[PDB]
């Protein structure tokens, strides 16, 4: 899978691919790897499909219970730590999860937390997760600056997933884009790689390795 | 050492139409190179206009269907005879499957029916409960043979408008029930030719607003 | 109990002649007549069954031999030399052709293989 | 670890009315890493076409080997090798490595120049021949190709119709396999003209 | 040996190869040149198992130099790459195979074209606009897919290569101690001393 | 695979199904498993497909050379002896399981041979994955002094049992009859009880449906004159 | 497999069941495990069918060539050739062979060759999986210098019991009688020997 | 997890027009040793059901006691225990199938394959299989072990599909079962000559036949078989 | 987590801990603080298996902070180290042990002395003038054996620490992305922002 999230001047960009595999069998090209926990919180999924879907859906329930009890939106820190403490209980049992918890709150500002199934929890500005993470990192790190336009940042996230979809055999299908602000997350569409690749090739003049 | 799992073969197929859905399965049941039965029903009416099949290890499949049928019964008791919607059925099945995350049900599950807007719905599950709604899904032994054909013929993948160079895709359409059943029958005839575990008979359950109807067709017995 | 004859027994003489080949051709001249004629729709090969004794059963001695289903051979000269060449020709048709290509060799190539075996007896030790 | 699925790739062949078609994808990888998108798997020796899937070093080695052997064949026989004869040569050559085999799935395709008869064949890694009337499949998406071919195929298709059928069989099979795709080539073969077409496909 | 990269531009081929030699716990050397000149217009970089790498590289070098003396002629890059591939394809079914991956960068003087061949230890050969062996390619191919054009100059090729090395220095766990860079063009082979 | 052999009054009959497999997939639906060793010595093959072909062709080649050398028609016991010694030497690694039958100047014969090099004699035999299904039919209907017609019937029924009940076997029944003082008659596709039904739909595409990037003519001809 | 060879007044008799097994499937129910290596030297075969056939074929070849040069070989000589093959190839063979023969000088002789390739000359011998169940019976009922009819009954009763208890043995009871009079083949069907 | 010790081989069965037939031999094997020659492996439950069991005999004896206890329990506070509330084949099967699957799910199976044969209240034929894994299936013919490989092909020639059931009489069906038992005696190394057979008919009820023997065996052709190829005598 | 170092000088304890967090192929982060303040004059650095390290550190932190509130008093470094050791010694015979190694640097306000404790995942405690966990000590102990004196200043301690880090940057294969340095003295805990 390839998933990424990064912080910049205008908030957070989150982009993921849509492929599910069973070994070399391509099980699906239409999976949703972003979960919308609330209007200010997003979760990304990489690893076991069931593990990710079940526990991130469960996380949504625990975040909802927090706001009923405390009359206040859960912090990104607290939400990420609920998931990391849960997987830590299951450590050694064989769960497979690589996730990013991305959101805005007034007290924290825009925040990204990496959480995985061996128990690691890390705050940071940039993360790429999954089988195709290295390919995304290659494009992302070279064109990254703090002060991209929202338009340029959305494109870079889209382009980094495209890069990984191309090179990584276990990533592909389509690109789902999100932008997180003060006012919440905004969906910026599903982009099929079968059309996007050729569009990007022509307009950008990239992918000169391919017969086009 | 004792192995608690087995492989009973078989293959299943769900297709969603505009105001209908089908769930088809072959009726052959096998172990190794033996035929256990030529007619052992694998697709089941579970009530509330929902059809289900859990293909793979038949004992786990039967157990799961039995537990879901019971879940529908207790949903009626606990919530004033309310109709279990297909989306709600799907989420319930995820919890049934993920409950045995560390000793899984060895099956690929498909359910079919109508959503709350009356539109055709097919949901698909892995052994430990990850799920997705789709227009198309094949599961089981000959899934690898059937799915690419469905991508091509139901979702019109890799097909373009003639004379447009290759820039206008074939536009997506809902298929009629007559057209879907033709694709189902050809899928299973093709799978039977090339997969040894597929054959004997084809049983299709069709779900509409009017209810659940059945159709049966002979398949090759070799 | 050693084969010490690792050197050629056929060599060039001062005049450029290969003596043993010429002498072999002389042995062929003494041998019984055999012929071959090619038609449009076939080929014929023929020879005399020169019987060494009337008590001998000349049917048992086959001067005309099948090599493949579509190829036949006849000779003039030393009969035992012919017999072993027919054995080798039949075998080389299988080993160097039929077991590779799944079909019998064409006439010219089987001839080429027999020719090779006869050349080697003209140069080997 | 499994040599037949390190590099990935597929080949398919089909017969039509007075014609044959053979097609392949262009991917070469090291498991998950895509390396090359120009690695063609179809070769030709005169009018006989050979597709090879499997371990890429053996694909290249066997191409060079059959070029070698068919060149010598032509010098000695004074004619080009035919598909039926070439099939037997492939089988012989694979089986002589019985206990240390080439990890490949070869596919022969062509038209016999004398009889005019369309011919296709496939082989396992040790040289067993499958001489099909209808179609032959090979590679990491062979299951997928079998399914596509068995449903899409009908006999006696004209060359330009057969092109559409084989292309759709390849493309849709490749898109359900992680280790196949990255471009594709289709050869349409008639008794004395051969057209080669590169297909536009999704690049993931 | 860890990272070897190659990029073919308009009129040259650039090879970049890491300087570190590490045995277990310690970095034994930080200035190792992981390359051999095979002929005046053909350079081979290499990486793989200790010992095997240099032994194989020098063995190929000796053979190509022998060919050059015998014929008084330089083999084309394509011909050298095919020779190397066959040696590796022979090796893989031996008692003890050579565990060596190589890049061959050459300038073909006949065609007036740069050429880059990537060959792994199995004998898997491909001609590429850019190439890498080992874990390097997981980072560097996506970059090159974005930034590469076929008509780039040698200076543009070196800047594109700096962007590859910066990414590897950021994201790879091992300290590979920088790279030695060498350019192969019509005038021969030269080393970029400051990188 | 299902293969059988059945002796009768004046000869022997062998039969086989026509399915070959690769994992659970059917690679060929009309495989030919009756191999000719010599004109009147034929055998049915089961096991590793390449091995059965290679082993029948090698021994068939050497039998042909032996026949020419000795000026005698080949004997079934010779094919048997040469097959078993070759298979024994390779200690089971050549996965050939064969039913060897034929007529020769000594009479009519029926043998089986296994991959490790053991042989057996019988009036009726079966081999392959469907051999139990076939042997059940043979044990129920075989008798002494069968006619030609009765033996063909029994042999094909025994293959059918394999076709219908064994997932390893399928498609068609191939038969070869070897009678004393007659040419051997190979009956390819003697029964065809598994024709596919007509499909519901035609999948012929409109011309221009597939997107193309480039076209070019391929030169298959040699270098031209002038 | 259940096999035995028994010396008696007029010579020796070999006996065997007729079952060949692949796992628990009976591959051949009418097997002939009594094989001729010379006119009046025979053997009983147990263990691998392939191995014992290969060995027996080689021994038949060696004794045919012995006969061409030196005349009729002794039973001891035949046993020695079996031994040489079984001993020297012990790592690669699974063969348990009983060698039995009739000379006019030595009369009836029996040699047993178990897995290791050792040789043991005995008045009678039993071998194969089914033999375990009849050690007791055979030891109590064997006498030296029995008649032909007594020795046929001794083998029939013994192998009947071996068949009854061993699932790896069954079918018909085949026997081969070796005397001055010649070579006689006997067969006994289930309906006869089961009711004993 | 265990291993089976004392074992029973094939159980075979089929439907006919008015009922069902089931059969099994009387042997308890101890590996290759044919240890126990008087073991009954068909166990009737009431006058409408016969449970045929193969596999581990210690586990068979446990199952036998469960069924015996099931009859006792069904009679409790049940005035219609010998009438409308009598145990049905379908009830007995589902109980066993539940137990089998529960035991496999605890990684401690009952090492058996079971066929429940009977006739229901409404006259309908019942025939269904269950094994150590909890796998269940029904078919016009059913068989365990070697019987699956050898008996089913023969029995399917009589009843190939559902529509053949009314056309098959009890004489034809019994003949097919008896022949199948002979074939298994020829070919299964862990079988015996002695067997039991049970017919459950909707009209004539339960007929249980003990001490049957395989008869009309062909061994005569054995005299003509000599050597393994070249031997002539 | 890779390198954690500690050095006790005259009037302070200095802890240096690497910034890299690496999972498999990629360096996920280059600014990770591998430490927790247990009390105002006691700092614990840590390294070991992913997840376990932070979970254990925060668990110890919570317990010491609980003690501090209950008694309105700061436990001595010796007392905190003994508590930590017992938790690890308990852990090693559990179903799933904590795979975590720690250094505890504290200033004892009663005795007016800096103290450095090295504790491994087994519960093996030692008080030392300088300490390291993992492969670091293979390089750094020999250095400190040469250059260390007990009466060194904090500035001299930092220079001696630079000499350790330079050696680790020269000779270790992994790129650990520099170190965060923290000083523990009579005035509390502070971070050296430029190193
Ligand atoms: C694409 C990516 C790089 O792998 C990415 O991480 C995605 C992200 C998901 C979609 C959110 N991950 C997957 O696609 C996983 C990869 C994976 C597989 C197996 C274990 C861990 C990770 N894919 C799945 O989880 C997969 C989704 C199905 C195909 C829709 N499910 C399985 O492979 C499934 C369950 C595996 C399993 C079993 C027991 C415990 C835990 C996990 N396995 C099967 O269905 C088995 N088999 C049956 C016959 O067909 C082939 C598959
Ligand atoms: C089908 C039958 C009922 O078993 C019957 O015996 C027939 C009889 C033949 C046709 C005379 N047997 C087969 O069809 C065999 C069954 C078999 C498969 C595998 C091992 C042993 C027996 N089928 C084949 O031999 C098959 C023929 C192809 C489809 C033309 N070949 C393979 O399956 C091949 C065997 C490789 C092999 C190598 C070494 C020892 C033994 C066998 N395997 C593959 O092709 C698998 N794989 C290789 C890498 O590429 C992908 C496919
Ligand atoms: C019946 C008896 C008591 O064992 C008696 O000794 C007879 C005597 C013969 C007829 C002279 N022996 C057999 O029947 C042997 C028993 C045996 C099996 C395995 C090893 C040694 C002895 N049976 C065979 O030799 C059998 C003949 C075939 C069926 C014609 N061959 C095999 O079973 C074969 C032997 C492989 C082998 C050879 C040598 C050492 C070790 C193994 N084995 C298989 O085919 C295995 N089989 C297992 C189940 O799945 C199918 C493959
Ligand atoms: Mg890809
Ligand atoms: Mg079948
Ligand atoms: Mg793909």
PDB file of N, CA, C and O in Angstrom, chain B residues 177-202:
ATOM      1  N   UNK B 177     -31.259  -7.848 -15.672  1.00  0.00           N
ATOM      2  CA  UNK B 177     -31.220  -9.181 -15.052  1.00  0.00           C
ATOM      3  C   UNK B 177     -30.963 -10.306 -16.070  1.00  0.00           C
ATOM      4  O   UNK B 177     -30.255 -11.265 -15.760  1.00  0.00           O
ATOM      5  N   UNK B 178     -31.525 -10.174 -17.273  1.00  0.00           N
ATOM      6  CA  UNK B 178     -31.307 -11.152 -18.355  1.00  0.00           C
ATOM      7  C   UNK B 178     -29.842 -11.150 -18.803  1.00  0.00           C
ATOM      8  O   UNK B 178     -29.259 -12.205 -19.047  1.00  0.00           O
ATOM      9  N   UNK B 179     -29.255  -9.957 -18.883  1.00  0.00           N
ATOM     10  CA  UNK B 179     -27.855  -9.780 -19.293  1.00  0.00           C
ATOM     11  C   UNK B 179     -26.873 -10.274 -18.217  1.00  0.00           C
ATOM     12  O   UNK B 179     -25.845 -10.868 -18.540  1.00  0.00           O
ATOM     13  N   UNK B 180     -27.196 -10.025 -16.945  1.00  0.00           N
ATOM     14  CA  UNK B 180     -26.383 -10.494 -15.808  1.00  0.00           C
ATOM     15  C   UNK B 180     -26.340 -12.024 -15.730  1.00  0.00           C
ATOM     16  O   UNK B 180     -25.271 -12.601 -15.547  1.00  0.00           O
ATOM     17  N   UNK B 181     -27.500 -12.664 -15.859  1.00  0.00           N
ATOM     18  CA  UNK B 181     -27.594 -14.132 -15.819  1.00  0.00           C
ATOM     19  C   UNK B 181     -26.814 -14.782 -16.971  1.00  0.00           C
ATOM     20  O   UNK B 181     -26.218 -15.848 -16.795  1.00  0.00           O
ATOM     21  N   UNK B 182     -26.808 -14.141 -18.139  1.00  0.00           N
ATOM     22  CA  UNK B 182     -25.976 -14.596 -19.260  1.00  0.00           C
ATOM     23  C   UNK B 182     -24.487 -14.562 -18.890  1.00  0.00           C
ATOM     24  O   UNK B 182     -23.767 -15.532 -19.142  1.00  0.00           O
ATOM     25  N   UNK B 183     -24.043 -13.466 -18.272  1.00  0.00           N
ATOM     26  CA  UNK B 183     -22.649 -13.338 -17.813  1.00  0.00           C
ATOM     27  C   UNK B 183     -22.293 -14.325 -16.701  1.00  0.00           C
ATOM     28  O   UNK B 183     -21.169 -14.832 -16.661  1.00  0.00           O
ATOM     29  N   UNK B 184     -23.243 -14.590 -15.803  1.00  0.00           N
ATOM     30  CA  UNK B 184     -23.052 -15.567 -14.726  1.00  0.00           C
ATOM     31  C   UNK B 184     -22.878 -16.974 -15.300  1.00  0.00           C
ATOM     32  O   UNK B 184     -21.950 -17.681 -14.923  1.00  0.00           O
ATOM     33  N   UNK B 185     -23.773 -17.373 -16.200  1.00  0.00           N
ATOM     34  CA  UNK B 185     -23.720 -18.710 -16.809  1.00  0.00           C
ATOM     35  C   UNK B 185     -22.441 -18.955 -17.610  1.00  0.00           C
ATOM     36  O   UNK B 185     -21.855 -20.032 -17.518  1.00  0.00           O
ATOM     37  N   UNK B 186     -22.018 -17.961 -18.390  1.00  0.00           N
ATOM     38  CA  UNK B 186     -20.763 -18.047 -19.157  1.00  0.00           C
ATOM     39  C   UNK B 186     -19.520 -18.066 -18.264  1.00  0.00           C
ATOM     40  O   UNK B 186     -18.539 -18.746 -18.589  1.00  0.00           O
ATOM     41  N   UNK B 187     -19.561 -17.319 -17.158  1.00  0.00           N
ATOM     42  CA  UNK B 187     -18.474 -17.328 -16.171  1.00  0.00           C
ATOM     43  C   UNK B 187     -18.258 -18.721 -15.585  1.00  0.00           C
ATOM     44  O   UNK B 187     -17.124 -19.189 -15.496  1.00  0.00           O
ATOM     45  N   UNK B 188     -19.353 -19.374 -15.196  1.00  0.00           N
ATOM     46  CA  UNK B 188     -19.292 -20.711 -14.592  1.00  0.00           C
ATOM     47  C   UNK B 188     -19.006 -21.826 -15.604  1.00  0.00           C
ATOM     48  O   UNK B 188     -18.314 -22.789 -15.265  1.00  0.00           O
ATOM     49  N   UNK B 189     -19.528 -21.705 -16.829  1.00  0.00           N
ATOM     50  CA  UNK B 189     -19.190 -22.645 -17.913  1.00  0.00           C
ATOM     51  C   UNK B 189     -17.691 -22.589 -18.219  1.00  0.00           C
ATOM     52  O   UNK B 189     -17.054 -23.626 -18.369  1.00  0.00           O
ATOM     53  N   UNK B 190     -17.146 -21.377 -18.293  1.00  0.00           N
ATOM     54  CA  UNK B 190     -15.712 -21.162 -18.493  1.00  0.00           C
ATOM     55  C   UNK B 190     -14.861 -21.697 -17.340  1.00  0.00           C
ATOM     56  O   UNK B 190     -13.858 -22.375 -17.572  1.00  0.00           O
ATOM     57  N   UNK B 191     -15.258 -21.379 -16.111  1.00  0.00           N
ATOM     58  CA  UNK B 191     -14.555 -21.859 -14.912  1.00  0.00           C
ATOM     59  C   UNK B 191     -14.559 -23.392 -14.800  1.00  0.00           C
ATOM     60  O   UNK B 191     -13.554 -23.990 -14.408  1.00  0.00           O
ATOM     61  N   UNK B 192     -15.685 -24.011 -15.153  1.00  0.00           N
ATOM     62  CA  UNK B 192     -15.839 -25.473 -15.126  1.00  0.00           C
ATOM     63  C   UNK B 192     -14.880 -26.182 -16.098  1.00  0.00           C
ATOM     64  O   UNK B 192     -14.353 -27.257 -15.783  1.00  0.00           O
ATOM     65  N   UNK B 193     -14.680 -25.582 -17.274  1.00  0.00           N
ATOM     66  CA  UNK B 193     -13.739 -26.098 -18.280  1.00  0.00           C
ATOM     67  C   UNK B 193     -12.304 -26.146 -17.770  1.00  0.00           C
ATOM     68  O   UNK B 193     -11.596 -27.125 -18.019  1.00  0.00           O
ATOM     69  N   UNK B 194     -11.887 -25.093 -17.065  1.00  0.00           N
ATOM     70  CA  UNK B 194     -10.491 -24.936 -16.659  1.00  0.00           C
ATOM     71  C   UNK B 194     -10.169 -25.217 -15.197  1.00  0.00           C
ATOM     72  O   UNK B 194      -9.003 -25.420 -14.898  1.00  0.00           O
ATOM     73  N   UNK B 195     -11.158 -25.239 -14.300  1.00  0.00           N
ATOM     74  CA  UNK B 195     -10.907 -25.576 -12.889  1.00  0.00           C
ATOM     75  C   UNK B 195     -11.556 -26.920 -12.546  1.00  0.00           C
ATOM     76  O   UNK B 195     -12.750 -27.122 -12.795  1.00  0.00           O
ATOM     77  N   UNK B 196     -10.758 -27.830 -11.983  1.00  0.00           N
ATOM     78  CA  UNK B 196     -11.216 -29.190 -11.642  1.00  0.00           C
ATOM     79  C   UNK B 196     -12.241 -29.224 -10.494  1.00  0.00           C
ATOM     80  O   UNK B 196     -13.141 -30.059 -10.482  1.00  0.00           O
ATOM     81  N   UNK B 197     -12.090 -28.309  -9.541  1.00  0.00           N
ATOM     82  CA  UNK B 197     -13.007 -28.173  -8.388  1.00  0.00           C
ATOM     83  C   UNK B 197     -14.356 -27.493  -8.699  1.00  0.00           C
ATOM     84  O   UNK B 197     -15.233 -27.457  -7.830  1.00  0.00           O
ATOM     85  N   UNK B 198     -14.524 -26.958  -9.913  1.00  0.00           N
ATOM     86  CA  UNK B 198     -15.778 -26.316 -10.331  1.00  0.00           C
ATOM     87  C   UNK B 198     -16.555 -27.216 -11.296  1.00  0.00           C
ATOM     88  O   UNK B 198     -15.991 -27.707 -12.267  1.00  0.00           O
ATOM     89  N   UNK B 199     -17.851 -27.410 -11.033  1.00  0.00           N
ATOM     90  CA  UNK B 199     -18.710 -28.226 -11.906  1.00  0.00           C
ATOM     91  C   UNK B 199     -20.061 -28.637 -11.331  1.00  0.00           C
ATOM     92  O   UNK B 199     -20.571 -28.012 -10.403  1.00  0.00           O
ATOM     93  N   UNK B 200     -20.639 -29.682 -11.926  1.00  0.00           N
ATOM     94  CA  UNK B 200     -21.892 -30.339 -11.485  1.00  0.00           C
ATOM     95  C   UNK B 200     -23.177 -29.524 -11.637  1.00  0.00           C
ATOM     96  O   UNK B 200     -24.090 -29.947 -12.344  1.00  0.00           O
ATOM     97  N   UNK B 201     -23.270 -28.387 -10.956  1.00  0.00           N
ATOM     98  CA  UNK B 201     -24.457 -27.536 -11.058  1.00  0.00           C
ATOM     99  C   UNK B 201     -24.217 -26.093 -10.672  1.00  0.00           C
ATOM    100  O   UNK B 201     -23.273 -25.787  -9.949  1.00  0.00           O
ATOM    101  N   UNK B 202     -25.086 -25.216 -11.169  1.00  0.00           N
ATOM    102  CA  UNK B 202     -25.051 -23.784 -10.882  1.00  0.00           C
ATOM    103  C   UNK B 202     -26.394 -23.371 -10.284  1.00  0.00           C
ATOM    104  O   UNK B 202     -27.438 -23.593 -10.897  1.00  0.00           O
TER     105      UNK B 202
END
